[PDB]
Design an enzyme around this catalytic site. Structure first.
Site: not given
Ligand SMILES: Nc1ncnc2c1ncn2[C@@H]1O[C@H](COP(=O)(O)OP(=O)(O)O)[C@@H](O)[C@H]1O
Ligand SMILES: [Mg+2]
Ligand SMILES: [Mg+2]
Lengths: 20, 341
Positions: B45, B47, B113, B115-117, B159-160, B162, B192
């Protein structure tokens, strides 16, 4: 091995969410 | 989430939540107050881009949603739930929503943000987490669900991908897209594939129990390196899930296997988290014997892994994504649909 099967599968990358 | 009996704690937490839930914040920023830097990740959904707040100099993660796309994908009410719920919750392991706003074309949610990934990338690179390592993250999710469910909230997309690792090595749950405040049963098909409980796949009414089932999958995937049910196509995954049959790696301890059988339980009258003893059935389980729940919540425990941060604005812990121009129409779109956003 199960790991070998998984690694060779088509869903080892990031998985998108599903909906209707 | 902001860092720091139980029944009393959840009582005050609920009071705080209901206040924001009844009167949500709205239009607390605008697009030109941020400098868009780079895409951190995408889902079905939105970006999410790393952005720089001009005035404060702070870095944030901005989730961008195209209103027309949201409508096409039948996510209008889900998106309203997402923003309304995220702006009202407050927990040490839940990502904090800093700002939110919209324009003629998109919806924006500016979070802190992390930042750990993604836990996802660290998990795939390393292969699998040792049981103590997995337990650490697991405990945080258990506490987070205790909090969410106590507010009548169902999360629905564990899920990993999220889950994010913060600078202290602690977990931050993001993506409240399928989150919903519901007392009774609900029926929408969402989540998922790999993490869907049997009852969701079989189009039955379900409840928070699906989150505990999802926890079972997460723990298994973290400790095993792969999910309990995998295949090349979702349909194949669904067949394995409903059959319920699960096989564990030979290196899985006895306690881990027992907990998993109780979490990945097809029978709702036996699935941990859903019984008369609630969440305590999980928190008092043997596999969590060495877990000091208060210490975890207080973040006094040493993280098994601390991500490397070469300074602010560093995105080295995230994959690279194709960038796209964030265009804004001269004509407002779907104004009625998202009036409360
Ligand atoms: N607060 C955040 N800080 C860092 N990266 C984030 C954060 N929120 C989301 N992301 C990144 O953005 C991606 C997409 O966000 P998400 O909310 O999961 O979109 P969607 O709902 O379409 O799944 C996540 O899988 C993650 O890699
Ligand atoms: Mg989502
Ligand atoms: Mg997501």
């Amino acid at each position: 091995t199960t790991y070998a099967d998984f690694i060779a599968s088509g869903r080892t990358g990031r998985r998108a969410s599903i909906h209707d | 989430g902001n860092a720091a009996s139980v029944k009393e704690f959840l009582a005050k937490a609920k009071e705080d939540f209901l206040k924001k839930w009844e009167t949500p914040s709205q239009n607390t920023a605008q697009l030109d107050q941020f400098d868009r830097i780079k895409t951190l990740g995408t889902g079905s959904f939105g970006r999410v881009m790393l952005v720089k707040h001009k005035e404060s100099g702070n870095h944030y993660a901005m989730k961008i949603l195209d209103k027309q796309k949201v409508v096409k994908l039948k996510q209008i009410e889900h998106t309203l739930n997402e923003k309304r719920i995220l702006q009202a919750v407050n927990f040490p392991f839940l990502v904090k929503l800093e700002f939110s706003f919209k324009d003629n074309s998109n919806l924006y949610m500016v979070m802190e943000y992390v930042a750990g990934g993604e836990m996802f990338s660290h998990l795939r690179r390393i292969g699998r987490f040792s049981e103590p390592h997995a337990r650490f993250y697991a405990a945080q999710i258990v506490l987070t669900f205790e909090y969410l469910h106590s507010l009548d909230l169902i999360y629905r997309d564990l899920k990993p991908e999220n889950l994010l690792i913060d600078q202290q090595g602690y977990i931050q749950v993001t993506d409240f897209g399928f989150a919903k405040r519901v007392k009774g049963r609900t029926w929408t098909l969402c989540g998922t594939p790999e993490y869907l409980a049997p009852e969701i796949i079989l189009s039955k009414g379900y409840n928070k129990a699906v989150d505990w089932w999802a926890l079972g999958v997460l723990i298994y995937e973290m400790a095993a390196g792969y999910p309990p049910f995998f295949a090349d196509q979702p349909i194949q995954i669904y067949e394995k899930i409903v059959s319920g049959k699960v096989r564990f790696p030979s290196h899985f301890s006895s306690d881990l296997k027992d907990l998993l059988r109780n979490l990945l339980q097809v029978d709702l009258t036996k699935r941990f988290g859903n019984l008369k003893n609630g969440v305590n059935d999980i928190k008092n389980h043997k596999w969590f014997a060495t877990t000091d729940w208060i210490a975890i919540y207080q973040r006094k425990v040493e993280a098994p892994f601390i991500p490397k941060f070469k300074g602010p604005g560093d995105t080295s812990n995230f994959d690279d994504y194709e960038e796209e121009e964030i265009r804004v129409s001269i004509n407002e779109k779907c104004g009625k649909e998202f009036t409360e956003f």
